[PDB]
Amino acid sequence: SVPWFPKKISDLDHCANRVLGFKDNVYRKRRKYFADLAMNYKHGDPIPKVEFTEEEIKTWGTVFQELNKLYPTHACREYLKNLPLLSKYCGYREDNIPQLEDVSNFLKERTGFSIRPVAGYLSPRDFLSGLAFRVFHCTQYVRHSSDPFYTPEPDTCHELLGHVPLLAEPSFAQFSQEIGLASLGASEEAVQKLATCYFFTVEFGLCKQDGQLRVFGAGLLSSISELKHALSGHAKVKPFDPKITCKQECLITTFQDVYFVSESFEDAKEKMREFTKTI
């Protein structure tokens, strides 16, 4: 039988709370403040605005300044076009952490996408289900200040700088939504291939633009070291093709062993369409 899946945008209430400086208990207190905020959030709520600490803003600022040096030569065209929009409209500054609420309202206007806070990792099914309603489950906390440039888990710096500028792009938002739509009620096996295709496009994808390799994966756009690595000569690069890409292991603790190149967002979407027919 078909497993449960959300039928309307507020149905994400019943799956977004199904969550699946590490010896710093002060940081842990701060982290669970953020966790409770997301757990208590219900669809329709304004996303709670947070007063980030001076330490957190400094971390964001250290991440922001270094990444902005790399984006002109590394990030895809669409990313470069929307990032200034977010600076004008959502307060993307070195000295200010944008609020999820403001970014959510900006995205609703540009592509209909919206943000919902999440405490931690959901199942691939639950996480991809939000995309079907143009809802991106986003973390709200800031990484630990001892290491601004590496984080084991994604934080709001990764969401705001990695994911958000592409969610503002209609062609990308369509692609993302169709990943989630295909996932709704699909088999566990089918969810796992869709999540892997998501991983190697939304999170770690490359694209070719005017003969040049550029990055659009959010996990690259928020990682100073892997961003440079991906466009270096050290990187194994293969064409995006869902039937092989879905067989690739998604690495979490290291650099990816391979990065997949899409011809364009429209082309990755068409390839996804053919692939979901067969699954």
Ligand X SMILES: CCn1c(=O)[nH]c(=O)c2c1nc(Cc1cn3c(n1)CCCC3)n2CC1CCC1
Binding site residue list for L-tryptophan: 121, 143, 151, 222, 252
Q: Is 198 in the site for ligand X (CB under 6 A)?
A: yes
For the question of residue 137 being annotated catalytic, the response is no
| Residue, CB closest to Fe ion | 218
| Rounded Cα distance, 62 and 143, in Å | 12
| Rounded Cα distance, 154 and 169, in Å | 22
Those residues with Cβ within 8 angstroms of residue 135's Cβ, 6 or more apart along the chain or in another chain: 9, 12, 113, 114, 115, 116
Least distance in Å: CB of 222 to Fe ion? 8
Residue 207-236 contact track with ligand X, rule CB under 6 A, x = bound = ------------x-----------------
Residue 1 has, within 13 A of its CA and on its CB side, a CA count of 3
For the question of residue 144 being annotated catalytic, the response is no
Binding-site residue positions for Fe cation:
158, 163, 203
Site for ligand X in 110-129 (CB under 6 A): 118, 120-122, 124, 127
The alpha carbon of residue 110 and the mean position of all alpha carbons in its chain are separated, in whole angstroms, by: 17
For the question of residue 129 being annotated catalytic, the response is no
Residue 129-168 contact track with Fe ion, rule CB under 5 A, x = bound = -------------------------x--------------
Out of 75, 168, 218, 227, which residue is the one contacting Fe ion (CB under 5 A)?
A: 218
Closest by Cα among 104, 106, 71 to 88: 106
For the question of residue 163 being annotated catalytic, the response is yes
| Rounded Cα distance, 64 and 59, in Å | 8
Interface positions with Fe ion (CB under 5 A):
154, 218
